Amino acid sequence: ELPEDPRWELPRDRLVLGKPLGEQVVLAEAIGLDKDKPNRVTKVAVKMLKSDATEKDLSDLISEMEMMKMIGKHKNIINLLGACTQDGPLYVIVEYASKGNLREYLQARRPPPEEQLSSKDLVSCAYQVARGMEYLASKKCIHRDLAARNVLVTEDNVMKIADFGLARHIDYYKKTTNGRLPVKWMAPEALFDRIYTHQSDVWSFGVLLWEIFTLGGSPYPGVPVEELFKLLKEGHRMDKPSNCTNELYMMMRDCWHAVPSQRPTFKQLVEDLDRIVALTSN
Numbered sequence: 001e002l003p004e005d006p007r008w009e010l011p012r013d014r015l016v017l018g019k020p021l022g023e024q025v026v027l028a029e030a031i032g033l034d035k036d037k038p039n040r041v042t043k044v045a046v047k048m049l050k051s052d053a054t055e056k057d058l059s060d061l062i063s064e065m066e067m068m069k070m071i072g073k074h075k076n077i078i079n080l081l082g083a084c085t086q087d088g089p090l091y092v093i094v095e096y097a098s099k100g101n102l103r104e105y106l107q108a109r110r111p112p113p114e115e116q117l118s119s120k121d122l123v124s125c126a127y128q129v130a131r132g133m134e135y136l137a138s139k140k141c142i143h144r145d146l147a148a149r150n151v152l153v154t155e156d157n158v159m160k161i162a163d164f165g166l167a168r169h170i171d172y173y174k175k176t177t178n179g180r181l182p183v184k185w186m187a188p189e190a191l192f193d194r195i196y197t198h199q200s201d202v203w204s205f206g207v208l209l210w211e212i213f214t215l216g217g218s219p220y221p222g223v224p225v226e227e228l229f230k231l232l233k234e235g236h237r238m239d240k241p242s243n244c245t246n247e248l249y250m251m252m253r254d255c256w257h258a259v260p261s262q263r264p265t266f267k268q269l270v271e272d273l274d275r276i277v278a279l280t281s282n
């Protein structure tokens, strides 16, 4: 019983549903998504409700779609493409990232495609994520769960921020699909005082920087929740990755400032990474 929005509405028959992607998201083919090109197909990602869908789970999908409509377009985020709101279940149509999440993408390219990423490719990857986040921050949006698992990669190797429109009950002991604790990406003030800001997202970006330069490495391996809490209270910080400059590790450390006001902004991280990209050899 959703109202139609002709800005985004795609007839249900223009969407050829395919294989599942996300754990609910499916790969699909959209015919004539762009009005100027009606005889062309576009590979898209389709988000829809599960069988045991709650009325809150439905309201959250609507909120996510309405949020995506307002945020606007940027090259380094997953963009809204359309929606099927009439005569059936709600479908939210977004951009498809063929190469999947950043963590796997980096893991697949570790030394023994599988083609080794150069140091310029690594600094460029961080620059694109910083650019996506800078855009979201300018739109007054706080991610709250920034990590390489939530950075998706396109066929053209473009980094796009994903799952930024989430409406948030947080289980600290719950592990991800690969057995990792999300609390390892949380700023201490967000973790202990539940204070989520653009500054707490910058902290998460520091952990993401560490993920990039370890090629999908797991932060704090073998550290349980209770022991992580102790490390943070003591002011413990992760070690410099192997194959990481002192400048880029200083950047990580700045992102992890105990005082949120003293951390760099995404605007500053974009300018610094723009300069480092130009001075890094491929």
Ligand SMILES: Cc1nc2ccc(-n3ncc(C(=O)c4cc5ccccc5[nH]4)c3N)cc2[nH]1
Residues within 6 Å of the ligand: 021, 022, 025, 045, 046, 047, 064, 068, 078, 094, 095, 096, 097, 098, 099, 100, 101, 152, 161, 162, 163, 164, 165, 166
């Ligand atoms: C704010 C927001 N709403 C969203 C709604 C859905 C998605 N979303 N979820 C998955 C995907 C893929 O492209 C995708 C998954 C996958 C797995 C293996 C190989 C290739 C792949 N591509 C996507 N775009 C991100 C969203 N961000």
